[PDB]
């Protein structure tokens, strides 16, 4: 599925070619973000949902740093079918307010009637200059974290300067061979492109439980976005990831440090709600034929988490 | 496909049990030498037998044909594909064709094991189930190393153990990966992980499942517990938890896998290409994941 001219095809980038006609496949909005500077409250709108794990980064940053109210949301269905992204009833769905769009594409299209790119969530939505401000995650945690500080947030700087380079290098592994590592594997179509990601994955994994051995979090001892944008792949991993992307040279739930951060999280009341695994699972099972043609969902992992228990 | 007339396609009736129940009499007989054994590295039917031919250290009484482990548009095939031998006695590409040599009329589903008697050049018994029995002991007098695994003081319980796991466990995992609807999957398997409930509390305390006797209830099982971390716990969604998670299962796996005669049987890494390879209604991407790296943990069991 993409928008071509304003119109949505689940027919190829398409008849010609590359070209033919070249589709621009990035976030092609990336807006918020400038020297100076941030906003409102009341005045942006937050597109979701609980499957993407993409989108899971800016829920729990809506919630760490208490925008809740300040920030309203529209919430799209767990099934991704002909018409991608949409807003029909069902689980876990809030509708398009302002636009009341059955579909994402359409959300694209009210501002830019002719759009052509990818059509995804999340995006930060302004509601003043009625279009996309920016929709690319990585930067939208930072529009967050930084100064709606000014106007009623909870205070939290999940980028500090003194560490922002750490933070940096580690953002970017676990972005190129984990976040986007486990659908580089779901999605190969030959052995070799499967092994050549999958492998990388858990050389990534090894790493990450080292690092974290005396420590309680990524970056210094500090909850930073190094963590939130690492936590909302494990919480989809061993009840998702392992089985349908086939990412299963172990579990999570094997890398002891690892699941202690996943713990860690899972448990924050704040974050805790932005969690929704019923619905992921529905997503992936249900919305991926390529690689799950009956769209049969496991009757899970049994319990695929823990909880919070090894302090003194 | 089946063999129709036949005749291989992908109106009659075929029948769905095996055909062959040959063997089984009073008399055996059992020469050596005599018999020819079809069987593979991937199928856990097969996988009994093959065991069963090395407990009985029946080795070189019984030659064996290995399939190939790709299960294509022709079905279990002989073509020089990775991991085994051929068939040195009809020098056949497909496993359809055997059936074929001895009744070029024959209407069934072709399947292994195989217990071929070279000489009638002829099935005997195609039938996993039965195969084990007379494996057990129709070469007793011949050179078989002593063994009992149908010892007759147990029948009853081995025969009762043996209809709950094969329904809903050995054919579970099948039907619950072939299962087409949310609804039937659900029919299949939340009845399977009950049998390993009951199977783990029947196995508390015991070394085996009947008697103190490494039965043929532990055969008939073990086929399907190999091979459930691996590959059925993902590619047939049969992941409610693994055999990892049950203690005493995993106990007997361990205990079975480690056993000399029997370690030789299994080869998980053909196992999974097969399945991986040939369901492609399951698994169309055919990508055989990687994938867990100790499916059964090691082995220590004593005092």
């Known amino acids: 599925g993409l928008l ?15 070209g033919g006609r070249f589709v621009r496949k990035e976030s092609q909005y990336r807006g918020g973000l400038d020297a100076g500077f941030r906003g409102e409250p009341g005045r942006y709108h937050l597109y979701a949902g609980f499957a993407c794990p993409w989108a899971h980064r800016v829920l729990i940053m809506r919630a760490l ?27 876990d769905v809030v509708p398009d307010s302002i636009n009341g769009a059955d579909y994402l594409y359409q959300v694209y299209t009210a501002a830019d009637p002719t759009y052509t790119g990818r059509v995804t969530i999340p995006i930060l939505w302004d509601k003043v200059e009625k279009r996309i401000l920016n929709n690319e995650s990585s930067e939208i945690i930072r529009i967050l974290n930084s100064a709606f500080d000014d106007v009623g947030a909870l205070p939290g700087d999940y980028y500090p300067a003194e560490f922002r380079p750490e933070i940096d290098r ?19 179509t030959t052995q070799e492109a499967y092994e050549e990601a999958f492998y990388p994955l ?22 930073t976005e190094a963590d939130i944008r690492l936590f909302p792949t494990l919480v989809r991993f061993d009840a998702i990831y392992h089985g349908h992307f086939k990412c299963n040279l172990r579990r999570i739930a094997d890398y002891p440090n690892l699941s202690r951060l996943v713990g860690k999280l899972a448990s924050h009341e704040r974050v805790a709600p932005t969690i929704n695994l019923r619905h992921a ?16 969902v496991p009757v899970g992992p049994a319990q695929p988490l823990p909880g919070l228990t090894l302090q003194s």
């Open 4 to 18: 071509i001219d304003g119109v949505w095809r689940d027919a190829w980038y398409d008849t010609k070619s590359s």
């Open 65 to 91: 740093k208490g925008l809740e109210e300040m920030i309203s949301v529209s919430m799209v269905n767990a099934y991704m079918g002909e018409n991608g992204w949409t807003f029909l009833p069902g689980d």
């Open 170 to 188: 580690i953002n970017a592994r676990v972005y190129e061979t984990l976040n986007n590592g486990v659908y580089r594997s779901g999605f190969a």
């Open 202 to 223: 858990f050389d990534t994994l090894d790493w990450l439980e080292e690092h974290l051995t005396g420590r309680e979090w990524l970056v210094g001892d500090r909850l």
């Open 281 to 296: 699972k529905a997503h992936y099972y249900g919305s991926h034929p390529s690689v799950n043609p009956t769209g049969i």
